[PDB]
Ligand binder design. Structure first.
Ligand SMILES: Cc1ccnc2c1NC(=O)c1cccnc1N2C1CC1
Lengths: 397, 546
């Protein structure tokens, strides 16, 4: 059986070029692909198939063996459309599972295969690339999870009737399961699900912890002109989100062309102004509601010393969530940045069940040379490169 | 000819290739084509058609006579195929062999069968003075058709496939109608393998030159001389004329530019000067004295021979870099001291605002990607920078930046941080509150400042903007100021640019500031929002708006 799939009207197959790969990787591909070839998963293609999609190799979490990874972003975006339990987000713990394996079992409408074409490069172009196209449902294709939904639910009902207290959500090649249970029973019971899943062909987050973090203002024994200026700056910005924020009293303390280091005693009025503002900030600005008809946006700023702040939002200054990320043991802005995006995407997946478009503070060249080297998810969000304003950073500190 | 499974071809969806009429030719050609064609007709190449064919491409006859056909039309209505790798092997990434033969198949396209189904579409015609009636169509890949290259290579790849699995000690390169074959076998063994190869191909209909007709090493490659164990940089000759047109000069530069990578010390600054304001390619420009000079110095340099070794997978790849001037970098990649695999030069990237550390970072990113392609590896770098400076730069810069494994090399001129901004205000140091503004309809602007010690100054500008004026103020401040300053501005723009400590730019203005900046002994720059009752700022806000 094969449900015919089609590209969005008037759209044509992807013709994305293959970035170069490390020796190590390439080999693993050649290795992996001969395997999938023998098993029929994929077949070699000719010069008449002009389409092409990028592929690479990764090692998810603690693994010596490589995993083939194909970047179907363009294909997905060109594939027709097909067709979220808030419960998920509101859980104690949530676990992710990799059901990509499941897709192999299903054949792909032969008429669509051509588009799935890809290439195993060679060093120094010394060799003609190894061209392939899938014969089954490929992992990463927005279309796979879909055509597989039917069989998915089936295999799921059981665990969903046995344990109708947990929530199982599927995104691409991932399965998200959440239970307010306790860990011991959680790590052991999840096992129960992978057991049930295993008799077919397959093989630790805390949502109640994600929110819109509070802006904190500096408190100091004494205040210099400089100190006060920087304060007013932050406050002034913050007034865009909280029009309740006032700076009159403080501005006054400044009236005059004094030295920058001059110490200024605060007025009872100014101290009130601060008091009042501190309070206006003890909570996230009212009326911030997520909109599904709109795109999620995740902005990240580099704070230095391995720290990174980020905000998820659809409309400017109306954050749905804001956060920070410290650094993973083992001096690499790119590993950190990559790790961050993955964290923020997963987190975005949980809550709204969709990936955010990233605005990365890095140069295209830099990011493209290495991100694939620390990537570890089965999915890939969208991203663009920017230049962090000097301000935006001081503010989220 | 050849018996390989033909490739399924189809015309771009919808499109179809109907008719570009025939170009009536003289009688000497109408028959000089009638001849050559009867030929191919027998060889099976072309097939006398007409039964049912509305399509047609025009034939031409060029000075021997020889025939040419215009599929120019046919092509644009032909589906697109999988591109012919235009990414190509660079000498520096080859593994030394004991021998390397080259087999020029020559007559190939005409050996590979055409997708029968599609042949009709190839129909073309031969004139006849009195047009009283010659219709043909190709049965094999047509010399000039869109898909001939892809369709051929692919067949090629399929024909070697066995052979290679059978002969892993042998290595084959397919380029155009060419095949480079090298190995580690002995002089006779290889010879014999070639022969095997040769006939194997004929077992498939692909003719190739024998041993007493094949070309001999070294082989010319995108500028190099390839010997199976080493390569030499083709000698580069520069003409000596009394007549140097613009054209002559450009091409020279073009040539010298290429040599800039292999050869050390090449210059074109003064030759380049000679094009300034040129009115025509055919124009003649007398070479200045300095020109007649570097050109000579370049000839001396160009005589030197550049020898090079290949890649040994059992040795470290190492890339060392040098700062040959601002924005200008030189690099050499070797495995054994002085035995270079590859060398190159990256020219001054002249943008809005950077610095060496940043520049160095991109140079490094560039070599890495080059390397991942050439060798599928990343060299261990040796950079003219101290881990401390890099540690200072990254640890404090706003953008994700990375440098793969590397090692400091104390080979000046070193890349450093020309200046650093204080992290806190400076005590006793004067304090300049600067500002500037410009109208959105006159582009008339005012820039100036007001400071604690009473000192001040305003100035008028014409044809400027908000950002140019704001910068202007900071400059003034940096001038009428002592060796330690505190500067407070309201321009997020000015700030950011400076917050990133630039040391090179294409703005005369910025450059000047930079200079000023490097001069000072202690600088702290600060920012305060625009139009508020913020001391000092509300003051200048009054002077730059009168
Ligand atoms: C032009 C070219 C491109 C790619 N590889 C090669 C060649 N030609 C050679 O002569 C050559 C020289 C040294 C090592 N490999 C070489 N060969 C390989 C085939 C033995």
């Amino acid at each position: 059986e094969t449900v015919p799939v089609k590209l969005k009207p008037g759209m044509d197959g992807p013709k994305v070029k293959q970035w170069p790969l490390t020796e190590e990787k390439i080999k693993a591909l050649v290795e992996i692909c001969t395997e999938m070839e023998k098993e029929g998963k994929i077949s070699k293609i000719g010069p008449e198939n002009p389409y092409n999609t990028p592929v690479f190799a990764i090692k998810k979490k603690d693994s010596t063996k490589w995993r083939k990874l194909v970047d179907f972003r363009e294909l997905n975006k060109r594939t027709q459309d097909f067709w979220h339990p808030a419960g998920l987000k509101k859980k104690k713990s949530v676990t992710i599972l990799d059901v990509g394996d499941a897709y192999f079992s299903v054949p792909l409408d032969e008429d669509f295969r051509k588009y799935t074409a890809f290439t195993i490069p060679s060093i120094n172009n010394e060799t003609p690339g190894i061209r392939y196209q899938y014969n089954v449902l490929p992992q990463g294709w927005k279309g796979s999870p879909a055509i597989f939904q039917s069989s998915m639910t089936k295999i799921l009902e059981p665990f969903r009737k046995q344990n109708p207290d947990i929530v199982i959500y599927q995104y691409m090649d991932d399965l998200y399961v959440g239970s307010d249970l306790e860990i011991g029973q959680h790590r052991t019971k999840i096992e129960e699900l992978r057991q049930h899943l295993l008799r077919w062909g397959l093989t630790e987050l805390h949502p109640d912890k994600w929110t819109v973090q509070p802006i904190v203002l500096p408190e100091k024994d004494s205040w210099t002109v400089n100190d006060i200026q920087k304060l007013v700056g932050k406050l002034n910005w913050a007034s865009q989100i909280y029009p309740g924020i006032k700076v009159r009293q403080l501005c006054k303390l400044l009236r005059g062309t004094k030295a920058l280091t001059e110490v200024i005693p605060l007025t009872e009025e100014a101290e009130l102004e601060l008091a009042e503002n501190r309070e206006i900030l003890k909570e996230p600005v009212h009326g911030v509601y997520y909109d599904p008809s709109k795109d999620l946006i995740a902005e990240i700023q580099k704070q230095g010393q391995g720290q990174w702040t980020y905000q998820i939002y659809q409309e400017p200054f109306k954050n749905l969530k804001t956060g920070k990320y410290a650094r993973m043991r083992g001096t690499n802005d790119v590993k950190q940045l990559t790790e961050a995006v993955q964290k923020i995407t997963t987190e975005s997946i949980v809550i709204w069940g969709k990936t955010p478009k990233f605005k990365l503070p890095i140069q295209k060249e830099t990011w493209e040379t290495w991100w694939t080297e620390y990537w570890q998810a089965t999915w890939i969000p969208e991203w663009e490169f920017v230049n962090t304003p000097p301000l935006v950073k001081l503010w989220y500190q | 000819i050849s018996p390989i499974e033909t490739v399924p071809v189809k015309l771009k969806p919808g499109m179809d290739g109907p008719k570009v009429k025939q170009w009536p030719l003289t009688e000497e050609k109408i028959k000089a084509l009638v001849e050559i064609c009867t030929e191919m007709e027998k060889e099976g190449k072309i097939s006398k058609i007409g039964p049912e064919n509305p399509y047609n491409t025009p034939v031409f006859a060029i000075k021997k006579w020889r025939k040419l056909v215009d599929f120019r039309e046919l092509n644009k209505r032909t589906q697109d195929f999988w591109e012919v790798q235009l990414g190509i092997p660079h000498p520096a990434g080859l593994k030394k062999k004991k021998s390397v033969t080259i087999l020029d198949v020559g007559d190939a396209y005409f050996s590979v069968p055409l997708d029968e189904d599609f042949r009709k579409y190839t129909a073309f015609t031969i004139p006849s003075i009195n047009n009283e009636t010659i219709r043909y169509q190709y049965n094999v890949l047509p010399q000039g058709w869109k898909g001939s290259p892809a369709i051929f290579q692919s067949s090629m790849t399929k024909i070697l496939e066995p052979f290679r699995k059978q002969n892993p000690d042998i290595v084959i390169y397919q380029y155009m109608d060419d095949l480079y074959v090298g190995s580690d076998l002995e002089i006779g063994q290889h010879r014999t393998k070639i022969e095997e190869l040769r006939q194997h191909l004929l077992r498939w209909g692909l003719t190739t030159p024998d041993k007493k007709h094949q070309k001999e090493p070294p082989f010319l490659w995108m500028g190099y001389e390839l010997h199976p164990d080493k390569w030499t940089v083709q000698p580069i000759v520069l003409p000596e004329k009394d007549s140097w047109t613009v054209n002559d000069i450009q091409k020279l530069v073009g040539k010298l530019n290429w040599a800039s990578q292999i050869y050390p010390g090449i210059k074109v600054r003064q030759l380049c000067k000679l094009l300034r304001g040129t009115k025509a390619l055919t124009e003649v420009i007398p070479l200045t004295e300095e020109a007649e000079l570097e050109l000579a110095e370049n000839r001396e340099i160009l005589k030197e021979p550049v020898h090079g070794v290949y890649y040994d997978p059992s040795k470290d790849l190492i890339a060392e870099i040098q700062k040959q001037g601002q924005g200008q970098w030189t690099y050499q990649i070797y495995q054994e001291p002085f035995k270079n695999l590859k060398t190159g030069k990256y020219a001054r990237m002249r943008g809005a605002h950077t610095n060496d550390v940043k520049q160095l970072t991109e140079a490094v990113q560039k070599i890495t990607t080059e390397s991942i392609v050439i060798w599928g590896k990343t060299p261990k770098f040796k950079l003219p920078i101290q881990k401390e400076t890099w540690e200072t730069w990254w640890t404090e810069y706003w953008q994700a930046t990375w440098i793969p494994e590397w090692e400091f090399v104390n080979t000046p001129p070193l890349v450093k941080l020309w200046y650093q901004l204080e992290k806190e205000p400076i005590v006793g140091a004067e304090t300049f509150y600067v500002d500037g503004a410009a109208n959105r309809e006159t582009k008339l602007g005012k820039a100036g400042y007001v400071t604690n010690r009473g000192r001040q100054k305003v100035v008028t500008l014409t044809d400027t903007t908000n950002q140019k004026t704001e910068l202007q103020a900071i400059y003034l401040a940096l001038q009428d100021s002592g060796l330690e300053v505190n500067i407070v501005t309201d321009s997020q723009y000015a700030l950011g640019i400076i917050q990133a400590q630039p040391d090179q730019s294409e703005s005369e203005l910025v450059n000047q500031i930079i200079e000023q900046l490097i001069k000072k002994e202690k600088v702290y720059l600060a920012w305060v929002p625009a139009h508020k009752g913020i001391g000092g700022n509300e003051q200048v806000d009054k002077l730059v708006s009168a």
